[PDB]
Design a protein around this motif. Structure first.
Motif, short mmCIF file in Angstrom:
data_model
loop_
_atom_site.label_atom_id
_atom_site.label_comp_id
_atom_site.label_asym_id
_atom_site.label_seq_id
_atom_site.Cartn_x
_atom_site.Cartn_y
_atom_site.Cartn_z
N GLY A 44 -8.39 16.31 -11.32
CA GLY A 44 -8.15 17.42 -12.23
C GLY A 44 -7.71 17.02 -13.63
N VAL A 45 -7.18 15.82 -13.80
CA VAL A 45 -6.80 15.34 -15.14
C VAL A 45 -7.67 14.16 -15.54
N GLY A 46 -8.86 14.07 -14.95
CA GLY A 46 -9.89 13.16 -15.45
C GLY A 46 -9.91 11.76 -14.88
N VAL A 47 -9.21 11.55 -13.76
CA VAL A 47 -9.11 10.23 -13.16
C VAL A 47 -9.69 10.26 -11.75
N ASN A 48 -10.89 9.71 -11.60
CA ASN A 48 -11.58 9.76 -10.31
C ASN A 48 -11.61 8.39 -9.63
N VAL A 49 -10.63 8.13 -8.77
CA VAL A 49 -10.52 6.84 -8.08
C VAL A 49 -11.55 6.70 -6.97
N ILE A 50 -11.78 7.78 -6.24
CA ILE A 50 -12.67 7.74 -5.10
C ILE A 50 -14.10 7.94 -5.58
N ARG A 51 -14.79 6.83 -5.81
CA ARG A 51 -16.14 6.85 -6.35
C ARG A 51 -17.15 7.08 -5.23
N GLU A 52 -18.42 7.20 -5.60
CA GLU A 52 -19.48 7.66 -4.70
C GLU A 52 -19.50 7.00 -3.32
N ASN A 53 -19.57 5.67 -3.28
CA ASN A 53 -19.68 4.97 -2.00
C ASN A 53 -18.38 5.02 -1.19
N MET A 54 -17.26 5.20 -1.88
CA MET A 54 -15.99 5.40 -1.19
C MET A 54 -16.00 6.77 -0.50
N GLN A 55 -16.47 7.80 -1.21
CA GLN A 55 -16.62 9.14 -0.63
C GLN A 55 -17.51 9.07 0.62
N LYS A 56 -18.60 8.31 0.53
CA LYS A 56 -19.53 8.17 1.66
C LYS A 56 -18.86 7.49 2.85
N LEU A 57 -18.04 6.47 2.59
CA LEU A 57 -17.35 5.80 3.70
C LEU A 57 -16.38 6.78 4.34
N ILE A 89 0.86 -1.17 0.00
CA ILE A 89 0.00 0.00 0.00
C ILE A 89 0.90 1.23 0.00
N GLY A 90 0.64 2.22 -0.85
CA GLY A 90 1.45 3.43 -0.87
C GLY A 90 1.14 4.30 0.35
N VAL A 91 2.14 4.99 0.90
CA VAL A 91 1.87 5.99 1.95
C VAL A 91 2.32 7.37 1.45
N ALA A 124 -6.95 6.89 10.32
CA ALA A 124 -6.53 7.64 9.14
C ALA A 124 -6.69 6.73 7.93
N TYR A 125 -7.00 7.28 6.76
CA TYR A 125 -7.27 6.39 5.63
C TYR A 125 -6.32 6.64 4.47
N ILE A 126 -6.18 5.61 3.64
CA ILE A 126 -5.40 5.71 2.42
C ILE A 126 -6.23 5.17 1.24
N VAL A 127 -6.17 5.86 0.11
CA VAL A 127 -6.69 5.34 -1.15
C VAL A 127 -5.55 5.36 -2.16
N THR A 128 -5.22 4.20 -2.72
CA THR A 128 -4.15 4.11 -3.71
C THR A 128 -4.78 4.26 -5.10
N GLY A 129 -4.45 3.35 -6.02
CA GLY A 129 -4.98 3.41 -7.36
C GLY A 129 -6.29 2.66 -7.55
#
Length: 317
Positions: free
Chosen positions: A243-256, A13-15, A270-275
């Motif tokens: 900003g360059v068209g790549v949205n990893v954090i989708r709706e239900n992820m945003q909600k979590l 997992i990236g930090v 604390a949370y991490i979202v990678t690719g």
């Protein structure tokens, strides 16, 4: 006079999150990054490799033979042909890879387990040199090769991985992974688009600063500091990507994530979202079962994870 060797490595997992590589062949990271190797408590989440003497060259991924899309593995195997000559008596080797329970970070594990196999056959090779060749298979292979918490310094031409903390430094901590069903953006989509942002030159400097801060935190085992920073890094990373068209954090992820902010008022996380379509939540071990039990997961599935060590091999047979 040997015929085979097996190896194992753990996913990562990236930090300090990596975006951008020098070219698609060598895949040298364009900037400094940082990460952790993970598995579950039994070490069952893993990538296993077998490299073995054969009459002809075969490459298998999760039991499935491949005819193409395997040039990177083949390249590494050719560069170390002399290692196989010496240990097996032939340059002609086949490769078999099998992943178990990995969320994200599986190509890093696959790359490191190749390195572990090669190092097992010739243990006085320099793992930092071997890592350079492994990046062609996966650019963050160093995270899994060395294990624990690592920093991979890079100026886009030379990259070097150093272990900063042992897995034991994190024994008081756990990661609850929330896995979502959204189709993920491929690695290369992230690499290709992120370098288009005019924020990218600043991002490269900021990533390097975050790495230094992480190394400072490590001096006093400030693990919360490290994961708090990883979350800050996560938010900059994905701000730039959106900003360059790549949205990893989708709706239900945003909600979590919104919900996580609520319960952070109660106890630390604390949370991490990678690719990929996963939300990784760091938590003190005394609160891990509590966090793992939340019913409001917004469609995601839960895995309990821990920080683990580097890649290793069994004795050749």
């Amino acid at each position: 006079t040997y015929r085979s060797i097996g190896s194992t490595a753990y996913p990562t997992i990236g930090v300090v999150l990596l975006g951008g590589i020098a070219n698609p062949v060598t895949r040298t990271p364009l900037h400094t990054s940082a990460g952790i190797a993970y598995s579950d408590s039994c070490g069952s989440i893993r990538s296993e490799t077998r490299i073995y003497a054969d009459e002809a060259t075969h490459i298998y991924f999760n039991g499935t033979e491949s005819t193409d899309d395997n040039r990177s593995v083949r390249r590494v195997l050719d560069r170390y042909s002399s290692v196989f000559e010496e240990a097996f008596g032939t340059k002609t080797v086949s490769y078999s890879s099998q992943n178990f329970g990995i969320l994200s970070g599986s190509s890093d594990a696959g790359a490191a387990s190749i390195g572990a196999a090669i190092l097992g056959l010739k243990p006085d090779l320099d793992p930092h040199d071997v890592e350079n060749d492994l990046r062609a298979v996966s650019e963050s292979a160093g995270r899994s090769l060395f294990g624990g918490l690592t920093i991979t310094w890079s100026d886009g031409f030379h990259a070097y991985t150093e272990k900063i903390l042992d897995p034991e430094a994190f024994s008081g901590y756990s990661i609850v992974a929330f896995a979502f069903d959204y189709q993920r953006n491929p690695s290369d989509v992230i690499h290709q688009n992120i370098v288009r942002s005019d924020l990218y030159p600043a991002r490269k400097k900021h990533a390097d600063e975050h790495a230094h801060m992480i190394k400072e935190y490590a001096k006093t085992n400030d693990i919360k500091g490290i994961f708090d920073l990883a979350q800050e890094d996560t938010e900059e990373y994905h701000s730039i990507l959106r900003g360059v068209g790549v949205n990893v954090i989708r709706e239900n992820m945003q909600k979590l994530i919104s919900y996580l902010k609520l319960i952070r008022k109660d106890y630390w996380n604390a949370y991490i979202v990678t690719g990929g379509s996963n939300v990784y939540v760091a938590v003190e071990s005394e609160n891990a079962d509590r966090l793992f039990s939340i019913e409001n997961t917004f469609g995601s599935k839960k895995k309990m994870l821990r920080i683990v060590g580097g890649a290793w091999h069994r004795r050749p047979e």
